[PDB]
Design a binder for this molecule. Sequence first.
Ligand code: 2PG
Ligand code: MG
Ligand code: MG
Ligand code: MG
Ligand code: MG
Lengths: 432, 433
Amino acid sequence: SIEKIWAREILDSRGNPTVEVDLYTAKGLFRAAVPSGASTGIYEALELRDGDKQRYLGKGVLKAVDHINSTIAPALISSGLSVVEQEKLDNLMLELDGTENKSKFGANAILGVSLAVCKAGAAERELPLYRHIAQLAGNSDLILPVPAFNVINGGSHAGNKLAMQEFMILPVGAESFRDAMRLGAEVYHTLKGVIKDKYGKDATNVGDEGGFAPNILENSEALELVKEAIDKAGYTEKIVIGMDVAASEFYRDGKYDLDFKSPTDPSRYITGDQLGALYQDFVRDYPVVSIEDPFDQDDWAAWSKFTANVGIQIVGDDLTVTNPKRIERAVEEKACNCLLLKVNQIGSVTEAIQACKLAQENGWGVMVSHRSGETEDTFIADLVVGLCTGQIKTGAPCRSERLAKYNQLMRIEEELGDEARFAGHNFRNPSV
Amino acid sequence: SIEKIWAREILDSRGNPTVEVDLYTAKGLFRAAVPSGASTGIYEALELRDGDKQRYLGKGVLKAVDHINSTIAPALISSGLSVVEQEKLDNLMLELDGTENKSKFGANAILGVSLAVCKAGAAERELPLYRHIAQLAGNSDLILPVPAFNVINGGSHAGNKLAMQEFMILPVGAESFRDAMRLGAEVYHTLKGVIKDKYGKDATNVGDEGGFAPNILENSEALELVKEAIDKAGYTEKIVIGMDVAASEFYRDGKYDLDFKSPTDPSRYITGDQLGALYQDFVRDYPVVSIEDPFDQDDWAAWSKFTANVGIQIVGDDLTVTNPKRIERAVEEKACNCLLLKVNQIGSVTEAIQACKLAQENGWGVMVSHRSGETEDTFIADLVVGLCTGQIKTGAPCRSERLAKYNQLMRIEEELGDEARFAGHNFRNPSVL
Ligand SMILES: O=C(O)[C@@H](CO)OP(=O)(O)O
Ligand SMILES: [Mg+2]
Ligand SMILES: [Mg+2]
Ligand SMILES: [Mg+2]
Ligand SMILES: [Mg+2]
């Protein structure tokens, strides 16, 4: 059973409080922490913050922590359920909170326990984490995913004018996971120089996810820099490009604002048809193979029309928020062909696994994802392997809240030894 | 005894390779990894790199990793020594290397085993890491250090003109380590707002250690920005300022170039006297209580004279490189009154505890330090408690290779319960508490 749970406030990678949980069994101690987004969709389960403006500027998580220490912990303990029963323990937590969006305890409260139970569960089974997860998910071929490295940053929170949030590289042609990391790192460090040469040393500092934020406006120019770094590294044949537009962040009165970090002005705003045609030029002119949140989380028509007019991967994030009910609708409407999977959008492991199986059941790709506020926790590296999804984005190869995950994928690859496989060019559908 | 040792290459926080080590005993797996400097002292132990231009720009550590797997690991397994015997295991390795600066295997090879052995030993003793360290050190006060947070990055850690490396805030007034975390973070976030309003959002990206990299040249202006944020956060009484100049990075033919990241022009260079005088202004205009590497690593005359002429903490880093020989010379010349402690400048736990005790017996402070290239490893967190040094610099409260250490110190404080004490205004000299 569970002997003890102890939750506390720690600092995530931007220096804001988040929830960490210690859960103890007769096997020992298991610790997990909860990440936090900046471009959070309106449909995500509630991140409970304290809002005491005199303390971490309103961002403390004492209330979430106390819900764990005062309510969740006593309950789960006295239940006497084994930590192998992921689903029953998660449902219990879900009934206890009693709300649909987990607004009673916070999803950051429930998830911190849910992850730590999962780690306890692995060890109760004497499996490493990635194999326990695969058992919870009915999987067997524990493929290593292609990493997607966020190398240039724009968007809502970025010190520059660049509207589109993330421009990523995917080493689809590397020989193994370890190899992909090496390609990603070389391109990254090459990019830095390409930026320094073109823009000045000032332009080479990092944003939240470890990528660079040059002082540029044109999304075509970012892609241009990324493709140059890929050539100059010499991997044109091995590395492709993915984008996270995060379009909800610049949605304005039913049109779209590509300049939005400027102080307001509706004359620039373009329509979804105009924004769709830009992407089609991007897909024609650059090796872009994936685009995430190309439209607002509510602009369903633009998603379906786009998806039915392209061959590339189209990824729902803010559209789907790892939520089964929202995914069925995207399925019905053929909104996209890939789920971005964020445990903290829905708020328990069990519901994330279910979101995963539903996407995969209906022929979708699935990409596991960090939040832009991460911790040293590495759960998601085990999650992507265990879920056989074949793709993960968890940062630039820079800042150790991103590398903690990359390094742990290398450890998994090495742990699988001779039986380890890399998704490479089958990242969208590694089930082949 | 040790059952097996597996080393691998992982990536550090700048996305370069570094050593990590998995050590197996009866108790299980003990893992540690090796950090890596950018402004590395000329006298530092050798960090062994591959030098293969077709692989991570020559920055691979395949060689150091193979030294561990193929030579050091059977060496330590054959000895049959318990992991608790830090000193014996460290000497074993130092003798097998047999060079002064560890250039046969690399400081990076030796250290990663040394750290792992260390964590395995704490498990064997049934002790948390910081207590085991305290026992190797012969301490039983486990005081929590004042954290020194590098909130504006310059020099070799940031893409800007700003020449001095590090502008640090020290919550000397804090009630506890956990409360020092809150003050640090609130000032950091306040400073993001100050820098944003004054220089634009483009000035709020960060350099290697998590501090803002604003587009500035004047070191006075960085100090100014920090003061302003302290004040706006409401903490002028409770928080003071520290600097790492690292003048070695900008020492140019007997002079100093405060614009070294600009196209070379030797007229802009100033003498060490001018540099010193500049330090005297900072000390009077700002609550600067500590300055690290204010002169070049070989510029001993400028060091002794500046130190005899101030009552603040003066920190040796590239001057001392965590090395007992260089420390003795610094004590004799009165170069400085604080040691910067960096396991990887010297290359083993045992050596680093020895360099520490040395400083403390000569009445020096000791500030434990991360490197600019870090990992998810939280060793130095337990190390600073176990060594009772009362001060640690391990980043801005931003980037988890920093926050993994700060979060660990909060966990250690919480674990000490009511026995927990906070160094505070005693960060130079915590033994009196
Ligand atoms: O103080 C220093 O000099 C260190 C650590 O902050 O930087 P580097 O690791 O680059 O030497
Ligand atoms: Mg988002
Ligand atoms: Mg997104
Ligand atoms: Mg240095
Ligand atoms: Mg230094």
